[PDB]
Amino acid sequence: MEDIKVAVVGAMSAGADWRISKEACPNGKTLISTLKWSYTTGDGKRYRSTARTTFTFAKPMAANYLKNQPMYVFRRTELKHSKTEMDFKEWQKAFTDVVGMDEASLPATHELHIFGSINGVGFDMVGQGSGNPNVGYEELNLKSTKGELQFSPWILVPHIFHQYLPYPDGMSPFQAAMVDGSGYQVHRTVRFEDGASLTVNYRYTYEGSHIKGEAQVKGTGFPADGPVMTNSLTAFHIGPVTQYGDQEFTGAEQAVADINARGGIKGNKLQIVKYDDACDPKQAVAVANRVVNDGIKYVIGHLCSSSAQPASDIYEDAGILMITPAATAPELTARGYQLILRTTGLDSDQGLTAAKYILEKVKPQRIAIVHDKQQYGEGLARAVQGGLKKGNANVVFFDGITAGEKDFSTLVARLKKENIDFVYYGGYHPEMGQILRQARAAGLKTQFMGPEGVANVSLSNIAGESAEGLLVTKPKNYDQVPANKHIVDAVKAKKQDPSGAFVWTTYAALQSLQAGLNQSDDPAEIAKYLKANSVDTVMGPLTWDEKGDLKGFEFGVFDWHANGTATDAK
Numbered sequence: 001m002e003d004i005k006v007a008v009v010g011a012m013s014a015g016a017d018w019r020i021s022k023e024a025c026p027n028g029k030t031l032i033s034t035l036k037w038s039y040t041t042g043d044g045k046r047y048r049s050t051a052r053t054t055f056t057f058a059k060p061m062a063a064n065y066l067k068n069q070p071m072y073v074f075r076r077t078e079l080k081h082s083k084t085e086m087d088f089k090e091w092q093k094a095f096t097d098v099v100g101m102d103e104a105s106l107p108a109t110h111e112l113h114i115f116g117s118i119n120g121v122g123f124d125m126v127g128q129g130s131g132n133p134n135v136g137y138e139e140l141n142l143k144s145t146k147g148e149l150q151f152s153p154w155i156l157v158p159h160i161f162h163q164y165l166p167y168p169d170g171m172s173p174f175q176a177a178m179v180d181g182s183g184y185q186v187h188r189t190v191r192f193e194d195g196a197s198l199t200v201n202y203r204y205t206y207e208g209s210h211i212k213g214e215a216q217v218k219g220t221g222f223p224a225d226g227p228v229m230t231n232s233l234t235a236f237h238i239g240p241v242t243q244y245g246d247q248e249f250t251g252a253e254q255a256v257a258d259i260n261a262r263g264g265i266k267g268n269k270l271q272i273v274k275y276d277d278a279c280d281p282k283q284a285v286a287v288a289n290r291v292v293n294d295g296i297k298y299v300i301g302h303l304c305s306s307s308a309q310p311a312s313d314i315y316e317d318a319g320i321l322m323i324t325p326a327a328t329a330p331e332l333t334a335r336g337y338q339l340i341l342r343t344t345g346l347d348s349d350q351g352l353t354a355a356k357y358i359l360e361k362v363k364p365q366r367i368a369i370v371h372d373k374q375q376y377g378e379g380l381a382r383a384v385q386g387g388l389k390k391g392n393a394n395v396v397f398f399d400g401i402t403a404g405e406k407d408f409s410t411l412v413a414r415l416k417k418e419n420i421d422f423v424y425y426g427g428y429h430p431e432m433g434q435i436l437r438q439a440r441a442a443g444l445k446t447q448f449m450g451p452e453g454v455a456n457v458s459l460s461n462i463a464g465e466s467a468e469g470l471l472v473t474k475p476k477n478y479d480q481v482p483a484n485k486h487i488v489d490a491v492k493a494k495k496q497d498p499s500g501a502f503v504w505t506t507y508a509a510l511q512s513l514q515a516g517l518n519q520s521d522d523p524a525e526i527a528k529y530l531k532a533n534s535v536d537t538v539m540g541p542l543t544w545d546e547k548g549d550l551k552g553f554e555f556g557v558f559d560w561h562a563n564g565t566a567t568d569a570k
């Protein structure tokens with residue numbers, strides 16, 4: 001009665017603050033710990049590692065430890081750093097199962113000497129710390145003795161004292177070995193997704209309640225242009241596509257809960273497996289190869305057009321089904337592929353809907369068209385330009401800006417000088433929000449319009465009152481259909497937001513997969529069944545053409561509001 005795995009591919013997720021270590025003991029003198037650890041770049045990309053840690057005890061562990069395994073340890077860390085100094089904190093909690101709390105002497109002080117090389121670049125750091133062995137807390141300050149670190153200081157986390165960890169009903173085996181005096185040694189091996197590796201070896205001496213630790217490090221095989229050797233690792237920040245990933249995970253989690261509550265697929269439960277492509281082409285190909293090697297046959301997601309297209313090549317070649325709830329560029333479904341479907345519409349249709357609204361209902365005097373030079377935004381800007389030229393509208397200029405720009409002073413001064421009364425922007429909320437708040441600060445009265453990628457609460461968060469009165473194209477308000485009220489209430493009961501279109505397109509993708517899995521487990525048979533039939537969903541009855549596109553899909557025109565809400569424009 002094994003679970004059916006479904007991959008859900010998000011983008012620039014935060015993820016869990018706590019990470020789980022699994023502890024096992026093959027004999028009385030050895031404890032083995034296994035760990036998955038992903039780092040994040042300043043760019044919002046993931047850098048993936050796995051670790052195996054070996055603890056060697058001089059005297060055998062007490063029988064109670066050997067009878068009670070495996071154990072699970074939840075840990076979280078904080079780092080502030082310069083290029084010469086590190087300030088660190090760690091929290092640790094042990095359990096006999098996978099369910100968190102849900103929301104002579106033991107040690108008091110310690111010192112660390114950590115040294116070695118990364119790609120042959122030498123380092124040496126020393127410093128003092130303290131902690132509480134009753135609750136699993138520790139803190140540490142480290143200073144360089146050899147000047148500036150010429151690699152990311154994050155590569156030395158988590159390596160920078162399990163003598164501070166208690167177990168549920170008494171001392172950990174680490175604490176018992178320190179109190180006895182005979183102690184333990186540690187060896188860790190880390191493997192990275194680019195083929196790099198790092199080893200650490202530890203030795204300790206106990207002077208009463210004070211621990212003296214020594215750690216020797218050797219790292220090799222890091223790419224010269226990678227984030228370790230360029231100092232490009234950071235703590236997680238919200239990024240440009242986080243809003244889109246959060247909507248997809250909200251809709252997938254509620255749909256899988258509802259399906260499983262009704263008995264799953266002929267009694268077998270669905271299990272979500274989460275991945276993250278950062279809407280980046282190289283990360284999308286790395287994710288798709290991992291999904292195939294993990295044995296998964298069904299994928300929901302790859303959200304942006306520039307990441308869904310390279311991923312689709314890998315899934316088609318390997319015989320895997322892919323359903324995107326969000327990618328709208330026509331080229332995805334224009335190449336003869338048989339295993340690719342959507343639960344959203346096409347930018348050829350979205351751009352023509354915008355051009356007809358401008359010609360029929362707005363009738364402006366002087367138009368500018370702006371885009372971000374990416375597949376989605378530049379495609380829409382070209383579709384709108386063609387529609388307006390056919391209607392003989394006055395387009396004064398057509399121009400590109402750079403994605404990630406925060407200073408729009410040149411564009412704002414040009415709109416003021418050239419007396420522009422209407423702008424169409426093709427692109428995402430981060431750039432549109434900066435353009436709106438900088439335009440109103442400088443006294444512009446211009447009417448703005450954009451596509452479904454700007455119609456979200458992150459646009460309102462960035463622009464504030466400057467967002468009021470923006471025109472948008474987007475899918476219908478599915479959250480206002482009475483038949484969908486039970487889903488709206490279940491999402492609001494978790495303090496989550498059911499208003500974004502990608503909640504509904506993602507829920508509908510899981511309902512479409514469910515209908516297929518009731519007929520066959522084989523991806524090619526599922527794609528054939530959906531292309532020949534109608535499926536009832538939260539979006540209404542869905543049908544697909546032979547290339548995997550929705551038949552009769554319509555984008556609406558709405559007024560956007562500063563409170564993150566959309567109303568019918570007419």
Ligand SMILES: CC[C@H](C)[C@H](N)C(=O)O
Nearest residue numbers: 304305326327328376453
């Ligand atoms: C996340 C989807 C975005 C907004 C857009 N529709 C694209 O295809 O890139």
Ligand SMILES: [Cl-]
Nearest residue numbers: 021033035053
């Ligand atoms: Cl460990």
